[PDB]
């Protein structure tokens, strides 16, 4: 039967990038024509696979990761990128085999008072390994004396909110991102194209 790409690209709520969502897709036929023939995406970059020439390929697993970030941050969802998102929120590997898909969702994810539901990690001691997901809320120790779960000076809650307002410039407007990873193991393949 058919792969539930609808449940991902068409989800009513998206995850905050620090707590990005992962959908494991298996045992289905994937119609990628639905995706690449869409006029509705503003970013659609594939690394190591040709999009049109995906339908005659089988993989053992496909992963669909989705979240929301700033327009200015979409460029960080790529191999070998740096920045608050790539370093501390969502990291692709240098040898990435997949596709990054993004579209402007200012009409959805911003409120007039500002939508504070979407969060990103702002403070972290070291960079994420690829496909790592840090959901910790430990108070961040920016100085010499420790924090003990108490916020304050040099003692910072690690997450921050975007607060998307519809009057934002594109760089501050929310974009929904879907990262498709194409995994091929020494196990029976379960995802092929039309």
């Amino acid at each position, epitope marked *: 039967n058919l792969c539930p790409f609808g449940e991902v690209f068409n989800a009513t709520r998206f995850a905050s990038v620090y707590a990005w969502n992962r959908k494991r897709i298996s045992n289905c036929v994937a119609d990628y024509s639905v995706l690449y023939n869409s006029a509705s995406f503003s970013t659609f970059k594939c690394y190591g696979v040709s999009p049109t020439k995906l339908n005659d390929l089988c993989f053992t697993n496909v992963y669909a990761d989705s979240f929301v970030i700033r327009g*200015d941050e979409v460029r960080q969802i790529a191999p070998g990128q740096t920045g608050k998102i790539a370093d501390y929120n969502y990291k692709l590997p240098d040898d990435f085999t997949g596709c990054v898909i993004a579209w402007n969702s200012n009409n959805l994810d911003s409120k007039v008072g500002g939508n504070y539901n979407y969060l990103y990690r702002l403070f972290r001691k070291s960079n994420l390994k690829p496909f790592e997901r840090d959901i910790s809320t430990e108070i961040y120790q920016a100085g010499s004396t420790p924090c003990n779960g108490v916020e304050g000076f040099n003692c910072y809650f690690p997450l921050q909110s975007y607060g998307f307002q519809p*009057t934002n*410039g594109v*760089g*501050y407007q929310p974009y929904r991102v879907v990262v498709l990873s194409f995994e091929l193991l020494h196990a029976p393949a379960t995802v092929c194209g039309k």
Partner: antibody
Amino acid sequence: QVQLVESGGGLIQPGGSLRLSCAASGVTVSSNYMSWVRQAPGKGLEWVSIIYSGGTTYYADSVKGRFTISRDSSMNTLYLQMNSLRAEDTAVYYCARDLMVYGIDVWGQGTTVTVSS
Amino acid sequence: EIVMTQSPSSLSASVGDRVTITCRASQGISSYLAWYQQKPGKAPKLLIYAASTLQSGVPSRFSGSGSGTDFTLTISSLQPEDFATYYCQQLDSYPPGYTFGQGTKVDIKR
């Protein structure tokens, strides 16, 4: 004692090299966004460089390939290596602790760089 | 590119006056704004972050307000140590760099 203390500024001919230090106490340099910001006489603050706690670095276009930011965790010190210096590099150079949306809250007192023939 | 337009370039104020300084973003930056004070020969001093939150240790007569494009700093009762230059900063901009307002010099009225 939360402070940033700069040193290393001085007078240097164009094309020379100069290495600035920023010694911190209170703030841990390697746990923070640390920036170099400079101010030319009568002009405004111009960002120079930043190093993330995770190691990522960025540079102003005007200093790319000539300046290098770094840090020594054991010394709790931030550094700016300035090569191929030019007259328009002349400024007071501040080191600062960046809290992004929380603003830039800790600034040093500044060290003065003068580049001239 | 987002531009910050600050006004006025200078204003004159007696002690006790209510002072108001304005900063306009060429496009919406929500609440990504901070205000600073700087005196001749000294480093900047952070006053307000996130458009309207008062930095610790800054006197309560300082207040920031606004979100989106139009922002104001407000000094409800000007004190002798408040004659300085003030300016706004767009926070977390792209490309990397700090976009500051042009600045407002507040001198002594006579």
